[PDB]
């Protein structure tokens, strides 16, 4: 329907959203076991961009009880939005990698390389919950997930999506994603190198999707405490 341009600049003098995502993602990367073909991984830059999602409000409800339960461990006024979120924005992750060539010997050579994750496609149901007053945000499931056939609510806790008993049968929240790599002109001929680059691209793809899934995808969520 209506378009908006939002600017949260003053809310970010000391901490910048981009930088927060970058350090978090970096932490995640440096805590992952790396294959033999890559020596180091590092986020060179993260950029949420200037193009955001198309947001459709689907329903308005009480927050899920699982949130309350979470708080119990470690109010009518509270509220929860169910949102259809469609993203084809300009998010861009630039990652630096040291590709390791082992073709002769072990660790024969290292090529500085850098990869670009971009063009992320998404179309999924999320929820945003206000509770007392920590803020919860979580991507529930893709719009066309089979567990929605028959047109009965996602907010059913005994239903498949929310119960999260079969993560394997869920269709991926990230619909598409583009990865490029640029390497030295000198290496564009060698097939061994190109194959290694391919493997690294795939690995990075899976790693990024994993990160997203355990940071934002239900039953995981983003918790903001404001005291």
CB 217 within 8 A of CB 133: no
In angstroms, the CA 83 to CA 60 distance is 9
Among 18, 42, 44, 53, contact with ligand PEE (rule: CB under 6 A): 53
Cis peptide before 97 (omega within 30 of 0): no
* Separation between Cα atoms, residue 118 and residue 176, nearest integer Å: 9
Closest separation between CB of residue 87 and a copy of itself, Å? 11
**Residue 216 found at the interface with ligand PEE (CB under 6 A):** yes
Q: For residue 102, state whether it binds a copy of itself (rule: CB under 8 A).
A: no
Helices (H), 86-176: 160-163
Q: Is the preceding peptide bond at 219 cis, omega within 30 degrees of 0?
A: yes
> Does 161 help bind ligand PEE (rule: CB under 6 A)?
no
CB of 28 to a copy of itself, least distance (A): 23
Output the CA angle 173-202-196, nearest 5 degrees.
175
Q: Assess 3 for contact with a copy of itself (CB under 8 A).
A: yes
As measured in angstroms, the least distance from the Cβ of 227 to ligand PEE is 13
Does residue 30 contact residue 41 with C-beta atoms inside 8 Å? Answer: yes
Instruction: Based on the shown chain and the rule CB under 6 A, indicate whether residue 160 belongs to the binding site for ligand PEE.
Output: no
Letters for 90-129 (x = contact with ligand PEE by CB under 6 A, - = none) are -x----------------------------x-x---x-x-
The reply to whether 131 sits near ligand PEE by the rule CB under 6 A is: no
Site membership for a copy of itself, residue 60 (CB under 8 A): yes
Using the contact rule CB under 6 A, the part of the chain among 15-23, 34-42, 58-66, 181-189 near ligand PEE is 15-23
Q: Please choose which of ligand PEE, a copy of itself, none residue 60 contacts, taking the beta carbon within 5 to 8 angstroms, the exact cut-off set by kind.
A: a copy of itself
User: Does residue 224 belong to the site contacting a copy of itself (CB under 8 A)?
Assistant: no
Rg (CA), the chain: 20
φ and ψ at 53, to 5 degrees? -80, 155
Task: Identify the residue among 44, 71, 79, 137 touching ligand PEE (CB under 6 A).
Answer: 137
Tokens at residue 135, please?
Answer: 């803020």
Asked whether position 52 contacts a copy of itself by CB under 8 A, the answer is yes
């Amino acid at each position: 329907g209506m378009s908006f341009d939002i600017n949260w600049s003053t809310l970010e003098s000391d901490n910048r959203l981009n930088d927060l995502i970058r350090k978090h993602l970096n932490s995640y990367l440096q805590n992952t076991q790396l294959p033999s073909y890559v020596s180091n991984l590092r986020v060179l830059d993260f950029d949420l961009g200037k193009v955001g999602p198309a947001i459709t409000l689907k329903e308005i409800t009480d927050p899920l009880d699982e949130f309350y339960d979470s708080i119990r461990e470690e109010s009518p006024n509270d509220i929860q939005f169910l949102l259809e979120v469609e993203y084809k924005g300009d998010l861009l992750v630039t990652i630096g990698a040291d590709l390791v060539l082992n073709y002769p010997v072990e660790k024969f050579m290292t090529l500085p390389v850098k990869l670009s994750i971009s063009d992320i496609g998404l179309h999924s149901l999320c929820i945003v919950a206000c509770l007392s007053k920590q803020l919860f945000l979580s991507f529930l499931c893709d719009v066309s997930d089979p567990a929605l056939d028959d047109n009965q609510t996602v907010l059913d806790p005994k239903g498949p999506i929310l119960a999260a008993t079969k993560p394997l049968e869920r269709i991926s929240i990230v619909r598409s994603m583009k990865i490029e790599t640029e390497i030295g002109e000198q290496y564009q001929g060698q097939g061994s190198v190109l194959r290694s680059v391919g493997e690294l691209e795939q690995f990075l793809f899976t790693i990024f999707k994993d990160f997203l899934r355990k940071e934002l995808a239900w039953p995981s969520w983003i918790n903001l405490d404001f005291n």
